[PDB]
Amino acid sequence: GWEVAVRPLLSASYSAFEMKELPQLVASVIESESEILHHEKQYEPFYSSFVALSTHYITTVCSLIPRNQLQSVAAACKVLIEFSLLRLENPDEACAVSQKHLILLIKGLCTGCSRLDRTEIITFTAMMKSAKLPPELRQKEVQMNFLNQLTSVFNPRTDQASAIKTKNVFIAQNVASLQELGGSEKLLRVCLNLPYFLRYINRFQDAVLANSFFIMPATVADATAVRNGFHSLVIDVTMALDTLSLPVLEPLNPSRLQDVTVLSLSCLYAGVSVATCMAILHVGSKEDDYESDAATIVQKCLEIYDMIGQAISSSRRAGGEHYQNFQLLGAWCLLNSLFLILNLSPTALADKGALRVRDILSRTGHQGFGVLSVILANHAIKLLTSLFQDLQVEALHKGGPPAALSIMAQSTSIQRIQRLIDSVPLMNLLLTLLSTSYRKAC
Amino acid sequence: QDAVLANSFFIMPATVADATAVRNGFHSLVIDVTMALDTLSLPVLEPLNPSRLQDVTVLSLSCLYAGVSVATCMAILHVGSKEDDYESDAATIVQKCLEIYDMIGQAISSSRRAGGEHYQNFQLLGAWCLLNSLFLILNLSPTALADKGAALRVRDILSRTGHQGFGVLSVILANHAIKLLTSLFQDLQVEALHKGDGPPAALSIMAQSTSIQRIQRLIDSVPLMNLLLTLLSTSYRKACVLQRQRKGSRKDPELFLGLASNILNFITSSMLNSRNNFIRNYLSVSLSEHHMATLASIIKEVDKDGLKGSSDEEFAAALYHFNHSLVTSDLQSPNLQNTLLQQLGVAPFSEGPWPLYIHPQSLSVLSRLLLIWQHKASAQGDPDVPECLKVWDRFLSTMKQNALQGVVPSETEDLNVEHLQMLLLIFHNFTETGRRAILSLFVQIIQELSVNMDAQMRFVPLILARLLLIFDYLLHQYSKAPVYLFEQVQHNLLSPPFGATTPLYHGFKEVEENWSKHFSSDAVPHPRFYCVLSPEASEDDLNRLDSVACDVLFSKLVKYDELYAALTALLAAGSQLDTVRRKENKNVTALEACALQYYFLILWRILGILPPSKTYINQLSMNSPEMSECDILHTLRWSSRLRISSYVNWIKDHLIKQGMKAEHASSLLELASTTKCSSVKYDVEIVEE
């Protein structure tokens, strides 16, 4: 009987999914639920490919599913999301699906559409063609959709827009299944346990101790090594961004809020370090491919910063001073990165052959600064504008130690700005950036 | 401020005279309110620092308290009862007051200095104030009013413990209160399960409290469930009143309907669907038989409304949504379930006649409850649910009684198709013991109804007709349950009633067509001529009766040899109705003619699928008796059958099963066969006679 299932699958693989065969696969999954959840690695590939293809096809027909059959679709999708989160929590070698692809499958079950590419879809079909598996039927099917309608009612609250609305329900109840599995949390665990993200988070956390900002991709050799580590880092940043687009960080509670800030400041630092490495590359010295990779990395770095910022801002469990302090920390990181990229010369790099803003400060502009440098800089300017507007009103009609590098850290406006001023001669950094930009534009 | 202490909510215009004085001061109050609102509207309080945040919050609540006070004073005036001018001032005050609250609120929420937990506590304070005021206003009775004839202590009413005083202003406050309630409950939900106890949250924006504590505070301050239901009932009833007025303060029933619908949605989602244990526990405890009765009343009111309208439809759907939630939710105790069923009149263990016709939600709810009960038993392999077996036996009897009386019922007094469908579904879930007992009871009922032929011959048969549709469907399907019936029930009873003007009955082709003609032209308001065995394919007469049904018929429980007679004799039912109504210069109405056509059709199919019994084969083997009108009809039918061997076989094998000696069978069949001209001459002589 496993045969007929791969069957509707391939029939639909050819020319879209036959809604008619759909009520068959839903049944299949809802049943083999326990099998998919607990199976032997002998048929891991089979089960994994089954789940991926099922998710993709159910998302393809998300907008068009019989309103009566809609509930069974939601049950089968809860089973599929269970398998996906289980795998993302416990990475398995016998699994035939990549963590990026699994995160993307959860994203699609929980979002408007699936994104698994067709090349990868045919790869899944081949891993399924592996066949490495371990009337009356109509009656059973309807009786089951029955035990479903009965037991639980859709509470379907919240003909060219009815598709919109069905997608809406699909999405919503799938999101609910996730929250149901606390996958959002499981998924924060996953985001904090990425292979390249572990080290980036370690360095950024070492830095919240006011140990100067200390980007590491800096020695000629270290920048060569990170250009080597550029492509794989893109893979991790992309995966993290795809994951944190879902309601992964919905309940921003101090506890979780800390980790949410951690991951955000983590890509911030990873991106600033990649920018510093590109700065060393242009100052000290497939290359175009690596350049595009690093550009994408810095872009998604700023994007994740912005996402976590807006999350803390519109949250009912976080925001105000908490959001203000997240902004403060982001601005600190960006300004320190700008300073490091500005003050690096062929001379210094060659002599080195772990920059410290305080090191350069005690020792005491052009070059290194580039297009990625423009990006970090514009963002820093936004954040500084915000903090300074705060300081205005605060001193309404003209109206402590530097703000600690922590999200919940309590500080006055003047204080956040004093920490941002004690980390870099600010007037200097700003004017230097102005001059350099003007010159380069000329 | 005094109220914030110990949530001692109070209002000073409790006395009508007090309210009158308050009204007198309405004008300047309006000016103050407008002025304050405008001042807040213009760029002000940019930094909501704790101190400023508190000050801003105070003003928000200041207007808030004033607005509810005005609403209360008006309610007091009404119960006691420039007039419009004062009403205008009061309405303006309430509206602008709520607007001040909302401004200060968006400010807190969006601000960068205190925008989140402070917003949440501001919302608690607001709800608390709104809920307290609403509760107080509803609790204001002219009696208590004159008794007083000043602080309206909510605690006193509760501690001490019509519902008049609810009006447009009450609706406004209720709506805003609902909004605040929804938010705090959504907050509860986002939190994972059972995060935690603790004390009622404190009435302070700065005070940091758990969402549960905030909700706990609201519940402790005022009974959330009671207030919600009170508002719901009052709103719906008031809307109905306005509707009646229109058939014969805002007179828009939709307004109250909207509020009522919102209340249903809030409870169902924020509470009923809430997985929070605390919430569920509170709900279960809050739930009372009184609430069930109120809910039942509203259901019946909606079901018996007879007017879909527009907003009414939305409210109706929401009502069902709430009803089904209750039926599925374990919060509703079995005691509460039975209470609601009795209040609807569909109690599955009540006495008297079974309600043949059941109202659209009264039926849907009953079906959901009974089916969930049968599933519970089936899940653990428990014995047939006694409740559903009693529905079945009280139905079979309202019916033996109805057919014994042979009185044509009205559409409101006739079994609805969807009801028949859910009953067949329940019959299936029953074990062999239950379904066999139902079959035996049906046989006994038909046999007893045949005891008086004269009465049956002069009665209209719509009800022996429905009993035999039932028995017929039982015959064809007595083991496996059909796919259509499932779909049928799910689509009709177990699915949102929005506002699909169709059930889903396999109607009779011949009967329904004739009805339509001699019937309302707009649409067929009701299926009175339908079928529940599907427009099936014409299988060979043989093998129609479900093998297991055949086995039961020939078991000791069923005396088929004699049910054959009661069935043959029954054909004369409603034969002299035309002879009677014409003698009395009356014409068989369309319903009556249609019914008579329906009955012959149903009994004709039954006589055909049921195997000829031994006594009757023996008769076909003598022919001396009268073989009356219908008797000869049946005889010719079976002779034609016997001419064909398949039927010979079918009938002879049934005789072997019947228990008749096999050789006896052979001989009888032979004689009846009258092979060759023998049969020709036999036909001839029977028609000759």
UniProtKB/Swiss-Prot annotation, chain B:
N6-acetyllysine modifications at: 681
Positions of post-translational Phosphotyrosine modification: 86
Modified residues (Phosphothreonine): 502
Location of this chain's protein in the cell: Cytoplasm; Cytoplasm, Cytoskeleton; Nucleus
Highest rank taxon of the organism: Eukaryota
Stated family: Belongs to the UBR4 family.
Domains (record comment): The UBR-type zinc finger forms a pocket that mediates recognition of type 1 N-degrons. In addition to substrate-binding, the UBR-type zinc finger probably positions substrate proteins in the proximity of the bound and activated E2-ubiquitin conjugate to enable their ubiquitination.
Functional note: E3 ubiquitin-protein ligase involved in different protein quality control pathways in the cytoplasm. Component of the N-end rule pathway: ubiquitinates proteins bearing specific N-terminal residues that are destabilizing according to the N-end rule, leading to their degradation. Recognizes both type-1 and type-2 N-degrons, containing positively charged amino acids (Arg, Lys and His) and bulky and hydrophobic amino acids, respectively. Does not ubiquitinate proteins that are acetylated at the N-terminus.
Known partners and oligomeric status: Component of the SIFI complex, composed of KCMF1, UBR4 and calmodulin (CALM1, CALM2 or CALM3). Interacts with E2 conjugating enzymes UBE2A and UBE2B. Interacts with RB1.
Record disease entry: Episodic ataxia 8: A form of episodic ataxia, a neurologic disorder characterized by episodes of poor coordination and balance. EA8 affected individuals have attacks of unsteadiness, general weakness, and slurred speech. Additional variable features include twitching around the eyes, nystagmus, myokymia, and persistent intention tremor. Inheritance is autosomal dominant.
Protein name per the record: E3 ubiquitin-protein ligase UBR4
